[PDB]
Write a protein that binds this ligand. Sequence first.
Ligand SMILES: O=C(O)CCC(=O)C(=O)O
Ligand SMILES: [Mn+2]
Length: 203
Amino acid sequence: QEPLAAGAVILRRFAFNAAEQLIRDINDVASQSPFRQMVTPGGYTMSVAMTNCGHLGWTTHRQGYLYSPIDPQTNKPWPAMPQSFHNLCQRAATAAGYPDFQPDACLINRYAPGAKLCLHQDKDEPDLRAPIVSVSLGLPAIFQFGGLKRNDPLKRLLLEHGDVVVWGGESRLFYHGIQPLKAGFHPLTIDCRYNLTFRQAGK
DNA sequence: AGGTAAAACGT
DNA sequence: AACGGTATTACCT
Ligand SMILES: O=C(O)CCC(=O)C(=O)O
Ligand SMILES: [Mn+2]
């Protein structure tokens, strides 16, 4: 438990032991709602490929960003959140000082070499102020963690296989991002990084 | 009036 | 290549 910011911590290798089962369950989720690179409202295709599980999934569409109970590609609900995901999230949130966290949304991110996620905020969903639990699997990536304003100084932190990052409270709306993924090998993911992002998006 | 796109090129 | 412009507007509700 290292102190990243007010209300924020990195739990290094927290999910290392859980990783093989997490990846099996990523493959199961994606067999039903495949990874897809989403198109921004402005018309650009994201380099990260995404899917979701749980009741609500993050998605783009023409009018903005949305949490949706239906996968717009399959027109079916997102797959149920795997118990391995829910258990890991709960254990990490508790260790980070958020024992009451009840996620209903898990965004699954797949990074090929070169893929990035530019600095952004996970904005508040209506009447909600729950933390974010973020699990890294596979190849290492440089995570940017800033402040409430885009130009606030960035911390740059390598996130390796099994690292969990949790933010909330005062740091809930902090800008953050992932720098372009370096090519490499990992025994469990082969050639990519995955990330699991747990949120409470629904009342 | 308040929130949201940019979770996306130039120096 | 780290930093910051752009949304300094145009829409929605
Ligand atoms: O891949 C990561 O570590 C961060 C992902 C993220 O910020 C997101 O999906 O909102
Ligand atoms: Mn995010």
